[PDB]
Amino acid sequence: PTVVGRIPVLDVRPVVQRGRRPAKAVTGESFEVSATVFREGHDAVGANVVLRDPRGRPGPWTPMRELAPGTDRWGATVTAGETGTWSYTVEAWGDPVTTWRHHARIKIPAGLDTDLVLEEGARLYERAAADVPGREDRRELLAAVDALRDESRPAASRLAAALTPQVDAVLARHPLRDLVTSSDPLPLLVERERALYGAWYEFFPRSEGTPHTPHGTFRTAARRLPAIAAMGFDVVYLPPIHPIGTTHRKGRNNTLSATGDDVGVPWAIGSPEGGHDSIHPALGTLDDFDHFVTEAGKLGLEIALDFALQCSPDHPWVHKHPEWFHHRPDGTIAHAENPPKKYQDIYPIAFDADPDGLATETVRILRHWMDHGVRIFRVDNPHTKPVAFWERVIADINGTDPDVIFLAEAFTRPAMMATLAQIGFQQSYTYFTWRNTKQELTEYLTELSGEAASYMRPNFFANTPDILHAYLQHGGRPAFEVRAVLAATLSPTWGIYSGYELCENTPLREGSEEYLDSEKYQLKPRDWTRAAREGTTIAPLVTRLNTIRRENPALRQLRDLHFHPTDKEEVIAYSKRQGSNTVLVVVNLDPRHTQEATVSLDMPQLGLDWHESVPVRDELTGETYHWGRANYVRLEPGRTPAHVCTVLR
Amino acid sequence: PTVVGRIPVLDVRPVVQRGRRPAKAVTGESFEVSATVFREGHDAVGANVVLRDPRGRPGPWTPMRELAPGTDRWGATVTAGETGTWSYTVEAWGDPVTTWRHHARIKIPAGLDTDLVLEEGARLYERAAADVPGREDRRELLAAVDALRDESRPAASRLAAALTPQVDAVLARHPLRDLVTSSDPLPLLVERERALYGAWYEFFPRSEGTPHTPHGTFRTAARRLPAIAAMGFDVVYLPPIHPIGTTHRKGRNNTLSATGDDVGVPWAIGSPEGGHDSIHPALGTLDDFDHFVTEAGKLGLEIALDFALQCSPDHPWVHKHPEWFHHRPDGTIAHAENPPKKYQDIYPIAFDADPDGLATETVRILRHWMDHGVRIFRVDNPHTKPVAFWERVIADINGTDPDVIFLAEAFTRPAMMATLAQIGFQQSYTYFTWRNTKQELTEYLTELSGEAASYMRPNFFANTPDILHAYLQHGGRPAFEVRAVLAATLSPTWGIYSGYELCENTPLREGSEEYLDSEKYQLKPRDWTRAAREGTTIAPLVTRLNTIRRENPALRQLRDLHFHPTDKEEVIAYSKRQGSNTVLVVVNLDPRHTQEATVSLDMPQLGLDWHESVPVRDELTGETYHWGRANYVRLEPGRTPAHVCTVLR
Numbered sequence A, B: 001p002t003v004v005g006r007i008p009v010l011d012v013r014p015v016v017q018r019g020r021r022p023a024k025a026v027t028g029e030s031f032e033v034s035a036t037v038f039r040e041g042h043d044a045v046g047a048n049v050v051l052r053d054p055r056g057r058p059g060p061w062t063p064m065r066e067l068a069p070g071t072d073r074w075g076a077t078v079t080a081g082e083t084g085t086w087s088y089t090v091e092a093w094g095d096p097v098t099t100w101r102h103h104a105r106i107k108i109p110a111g112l113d114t115d116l117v118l119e120e121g122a123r124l125y126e127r128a129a130a131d132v133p134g135r136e137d138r139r140e141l142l143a144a145v146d147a148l149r150d151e152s153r154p155a156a157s158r159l160a161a162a163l164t165p166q167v168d169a170v171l172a173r174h175p176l177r178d179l180v181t182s183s184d185p186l187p188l189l190v191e192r193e194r195a196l197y198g199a200w201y202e203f204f205p206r207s208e209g210t211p212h213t214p215h216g217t218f219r220t221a222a223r224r225l226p227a228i229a230a231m232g233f234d235v236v237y238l239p240p241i242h243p244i245g246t247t248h249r250k251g252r253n254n255t256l257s258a259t260g261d262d263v264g265v266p267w268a269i270g271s272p273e274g275g276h277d278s279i280h281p282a283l284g285t286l287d288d289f290d291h292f293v294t295e296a297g298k299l300g301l302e303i304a305l306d307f308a309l310q311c312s313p314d315h316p317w318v319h320k321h322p323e324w325f326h327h328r329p330d331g332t333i334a335h336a337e338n339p340p341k342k343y344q345d346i347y348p349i350a351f352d353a354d355p356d357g358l359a360t361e362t363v364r365i366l367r368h369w370m371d372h373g374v375r376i377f378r379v380d381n382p383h384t385k386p387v388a389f390w391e392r393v394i395a396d397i398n399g400t401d402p403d404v405i406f407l408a409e410a411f412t413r414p415a416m417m418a419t420l421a422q423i424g425f426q427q428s429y430t431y432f433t434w435r436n437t438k439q440e441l442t443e444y445l446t447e448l449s450g451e452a453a454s455y456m457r458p459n460f461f462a463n464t465p466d467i468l469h470a471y472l473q474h475g476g477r478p479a480f481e482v483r484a485v486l487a488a489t490l491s492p493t494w495g496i497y498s499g500y501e502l503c504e505n506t507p508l509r510e511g512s513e514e515y516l517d518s519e520k521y522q523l524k525p526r527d528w529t530r531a532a533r534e535g536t537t538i539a540p541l542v543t544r545l546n547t548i549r550r551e552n553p554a555l556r557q558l559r560d561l562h563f564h565p566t567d568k569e570e571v572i573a574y575s576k577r578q579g580s581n582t583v584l585v586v587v588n589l590d591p592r593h594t595q596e597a598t599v600s601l602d603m604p605q606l607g608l609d610w611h612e613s614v615p616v617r618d619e620l621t622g623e624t625y626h627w628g629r630a631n632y633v634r635l636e637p638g639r640t641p642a643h644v645c646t647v648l649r
C-alpha cells in the first residue's frame, strides 16, 4: 500500500501536533480547511471538504478553490455546529468536465476534430447525469447531451448548449468526480461560544465592604454585580476565595512582614481554617458563595474562579502530604519564585513523588467548585507546573464535563504558551499589554488571527493587578479609552481588572508595572457613585463597546481580520467580517496629540469595488459618514479615541 | 497516556509527510536533527539525539544545544553510516547540575545559606558519580563531593572545587539527566554516495559513428568513453537505446514528417523490432551493450539508462495491451503533449484500466536492464504518470535492490517536484538553468540546501538537449565557463549534455531554448580532435572542476553552504565546508564585462575571528592569496570566470 493516493491530497490544515491533538472551533465559528491537491498530467482537479459530526454524519457539499495561482494550495470555509469531537476530510478528484470544456472552447472554433470532441463531452455529461438525484436537473443535463450529439446543428451551437447557466448550476452542485481520493481524517474539538467570545471583569470581593465591616463579604460583594452586568460583561473573575496563610504573610505594597490588620494576598492559599476547597471565613460560608453565584447567574454573569496550585506554609497539605513539596536537606521548603519576583508567602508544589495523588486531589477540588456552579477556571501560572499534568487534568474534567473552560495565565515564552493551548486550555492570556505601537499590534494580531487560531483563543485583559503598562501610566484617561477599544475590537474575548474604568494609573515607582498600594496586599474601597456622577469613569465607553460587540457578529470572532493602510504611524485601521456584518475601526494610538490621517481601504477585502462608496455609522457617536477608497480622519485624544464603524447594509 | 511527556520534546525535524515517509541521507553525510525542548518552571534542560542503525544499535552521545536564545529550539549534527533504514529519537531531560551551578555562583558570594547550598551540590554530584563507569572519573567527582562538604574550608573555595575543568569534562561526557523523555522515532533512509554526489555526462551513441557508417553503434560509441572519464565524470546518461517508431516519426529540427533517411527521436520508443526491453538494431545487440557497459565500468563510469514510459504508435504494446492507452470514441489514441509542446510521434500511457499489469511489466523491464549492470535510471517526465505508480515501482525495485537510483526529470510546479522526491526519487532535476542572477542563485540554493535537502537531492545539468538558456545564447564561451563553475560548486551532483564543452549556443530561433539542428532529430558528428588541438573546448576547465570536487569533501555535500556579501550585483560569493575542508568561490555572473568588487567574508561563518587573515589557493590557476574580512577581486570574462579557492591548512 502506498502513502499517496490516486489523486494527491497532502498536508491538510489545520493540524495540531501532527494530528495527535485536535484543532479547535466553537459553535457557529467559521474557518478555512486547506490542502495541497494536484494530479499527474495536465488535466484539472477539484476538491471538497467533508466535515463529520460526533455521530459521524457528513455536512453539506463544500467545494474548495485554489487559493493562489500556480500554488496547488486549495481551501474552503466550513462552520462548526453542536459541541463535541468532529472530524474532517478533504476529497480530491479529477475534473474531466472542466478539462473537456477548456479543450472544446479552443478546438471547436479551430475546427479540430469537432465530432469527436462533442461526442466525448456527451459521454461525460451522461455519466454526470446518472449520479444526479434531482429529476429536473437530470433532464437538464440529458437535454445538453442530446444537443451535443445533434449532428444536424453547427459545432459552436452544439457546444454552447453544454455551457449554459443552468447546466453550470447543476454541475456546480453535482460534479462528475473522477478517481476520488481522501485524506485520513483529522480531529476537531468544538466547544461552547464562551470559550471564544465573552467580556470579563476582575474584582476582589473583600474590597467591597462597609463602614462597620471594611472586609467585604460575598453578600456585600454581590451588590457590585448589577453594575458589572450593566457594563455588558459576561464573566466575573474572582481572585482566590480561600483562607489566607499567616506565616510570611505579605504587608501593604509587597512588603515582607504583615502587621496586625494586614489581610495578605489571596494567592497565599491555606491555613488551619481550610485550603482550596474552603471559603475565607471573612467572606462568609459556602451558602453565601452559592448566593453570590445565583445572583450572578440571574444577571447573565458566569463566575470564573482562580485556581492556583500552590500553598501557604500553613496549608494543611504541608503536613498532610509533605511529599507534594521539595524539601532541602535541612527539611525546609524553598519559597516559590518568578525572578526577579519572589513569593516568600507561598511554597510551590512538587509533582514527581506523588503525581497520581496530586492529580486526583486537583480534579476533586475542581469538581467541588463545579458542583457549586463554577464552570470556568482561571489557572494561575500554569507554566510552573508540568505540561502533561495540565493535559491529564483538563482531559479528566472535560471527559465528564465538556462545558468547563480553562484560561491559562502564562506570560512566558511562545513555545510553552502554544503548547499549553494545544494540550487543552480553551483560552490563553497573551502579550497584548506589551503590544502598544501600530507595528506591534499589527504583527501580534496577524499572528493570533492566523494559524494560531486553530489552537489558541486569546483573552485580552487591557490590565491586570500585576500589569499596569507604561502606556497607561503616561497616557492617562485617553490611553485607557484606546486600549479598551483595541482589546474589545481585536479579540472576541477581552477583560479589565476593577479600577481600570477609573483610569487608575499610579505605579509603585518609575519603570514598574505594579500599581501603587496594590489591591493584592490591601482592601481597596472605591467611591463608584461619585465617579459616576462626576464623570471620572470610562464605564459608559466600556458599556457601549460591549453593546456594539453584542450587536455585531463580526466582533464575536477572531480569524477574520484585516489591516488597512494609513499614512500615519500613530493611526491604525482594521476590519472584521461575519456574514454581511462588517465592522471598520480606526484608532489613534497617540494619547497626547490629535492625529489626522488618510485611511486607504482595501475595498475588495471589504467585498466592494474600488470606486464604491459605502455608508458607515460610527457606533461610538451615532454619526454617519460615507466612506470609500481614501478617507480623511481627525481624532482628538479625550474627545475621540477612535472610530468604531459598522458598514450599513 | 498523555501526548506530551514529562519533559516536553516537540516537533522533531527533519520530518517528511508527518513521518509517513523517511527523511534522506547518504553514507558519511552530516545533517542537523532539531526539536523544541523546554520544561516547566525555571530550571535548566538538556537534550541529545539518539541515532539508531538498521540493527537498532545506538550511535554515540550527541548532545544538543539551543540554536538561538529564547527560541527553545535545540539542534545537533548527526552522520549517517551504512545504507539501510535507520531511525532517530530526541531525548530531553532536566539538567539539575547546570541549575545548581547557576544558583551556587550567586548565593555563595552573597553568603546566603552556604552550608545548605553546598550540601545540595554534593548530593547532586554523588548521584552523578553513581552512574560514571570510569574509576578515575568517579574518583574525580567523589573528590569534589568531599571538598564541597568540607566545612572547615571557605565557601568560595569549597565551591570552586566543584567547577574545575576536569569536573566539567566528566560531566560533559556523563551528565546527570533528570526525567528523561523521548520523542517517537522518525525514519531515515540512508542510501549510497552516488545518490548525492557524482558528475554526469549525457551523449547520444548514434552520433559517434564513422564516415562509412554514420549511425554509430555501441561498439563505436564506446570510443568516446575514455574522453568522458578523462574529464572526471562518474555517470554516463544515454537517451533511449530502443527501436524507434516509423509512424509520425519526426524529421530534422522537430519537423512533422521525416524524410527517408531521418533517424527520428529516441523517445519515440518501439517498433516491430522490439520495445523497452530491446536494443535499436543500428546500435547493435544486447551483447554489444554488455561490452559498452563493461568498458564503462573499467573506466569508473556507471551507466544511467533513460526510462520513458510511453510508446511510439508501432510499439507492440499498442496491439498487445490496448487498455494501456486511452482511446477516443473513434478508437484513435491522442498523441502525448506538454503544452505548448506536442509529441505527435508518441502515445501516453493510461493507468486506470490495468494498473497491476503496468506495474508488473515496468519492474520486469527495469530488472532486465538491472541484470545487465544498469543501476541508475533517468526517468523521463515522471509527473505525467501517477505519483502512486512511481511510489509503488520504486518501492518494489528498491525492496530487492536498494542501490538502484532514480532521477526524476520533472520540470513542473513545486508541489509535484517535492512529492516525487518524497515518495522515493533519489534525485531530482531542478530549476537551475532558469536561475542566472545573484538573487535567483542565492534564493534557490538557500531553498535547496535547507529543509528541502531532507527529501530532495538535486542534479544540476547546466544544459540538456531541451534546454539552451538565453544566458548561454547571449553569453558565449564565458557564459559556459561560469555555469560550469556554478553547477559544479553548488551541487554535489552536476551534469552537462555533449556539445556544452564546445560552447554550442545557436538556438532554433530568437527566444527559444531549443538548439538549432537538435541532436534529438539527427545524427550530430563532432570533430572532438580539432576542438582539442585548437583549444575551442572548455573540456580542460570541466576536467579541473571535477578534480577539485574529487579533492575537496566540501563540494561533495549539499547542506553546508553560505553566501558572503559583495558590493557588486554581478559578483557572487559563497562557501562550503566539510570537516576542515573549506571551499570559497567568487563568480562574476557578467559574461561581457570585467567586474571588480569587494567581497566581505562572514569570518565566523568560516570559523575564524573577524581580524584573522587566512591564506587561500585559487585551484583554477594555482595562485595563492591571503584573504580576510574584506577583499578586492577583479574578474575578466574569458580570462577568469571565477575564483574557486580552498582555504589552506
Ligand SMILES: OC[C@H]1O[C@H](O[C@H]2[C@H](O)[C@@H](O)[C@@H](O)O[C@@H]2CO)[C@H](O)[C@@H](O)[C@@H]1O
Residues within 6 Å of the ligand: A250, A254, A265, A266, A267, A268, A269, A308, A342, A343, A344, A345, A346, A380, A381, A409, A465, A466, A520
Ligand atoms: O501570594 C503569592 C503572590 O501573589 C501575587 O503574585 C501572583 C500574581 O498576582 C498572579 O496573577 C500570578 O502571576 O502568580 C503570582 C502568584 O500566584 C503577588 O503579586 C505576589 O507578591 C505574592 O507573593
Ligand SMILES: OC[C@H]1O[C@H](O[C@H]2[C@H](O)[C@@H](O)[C@@H](O)O[C@@H]2CO)[C@H](O)[C@@H](O)[C@@H]1O
Residues within 6 Å of the ligand: B250, B254, B265, B266, B267, B268, B269, B308, B342, B343, B344, B345, B346, B380, B381, B465, B466, B520
Ligand atoms: O519522441 C518523443 C518526443 O521526445 C522529445 O521530448 C522529450 C524530451 O527530450 C525529454 O527531455 C522530456 O522533455 O520528455 C520529452 C518526451 O519524452 C522531443 O524533444 C519531442 O520533440 C518528441 O516528440
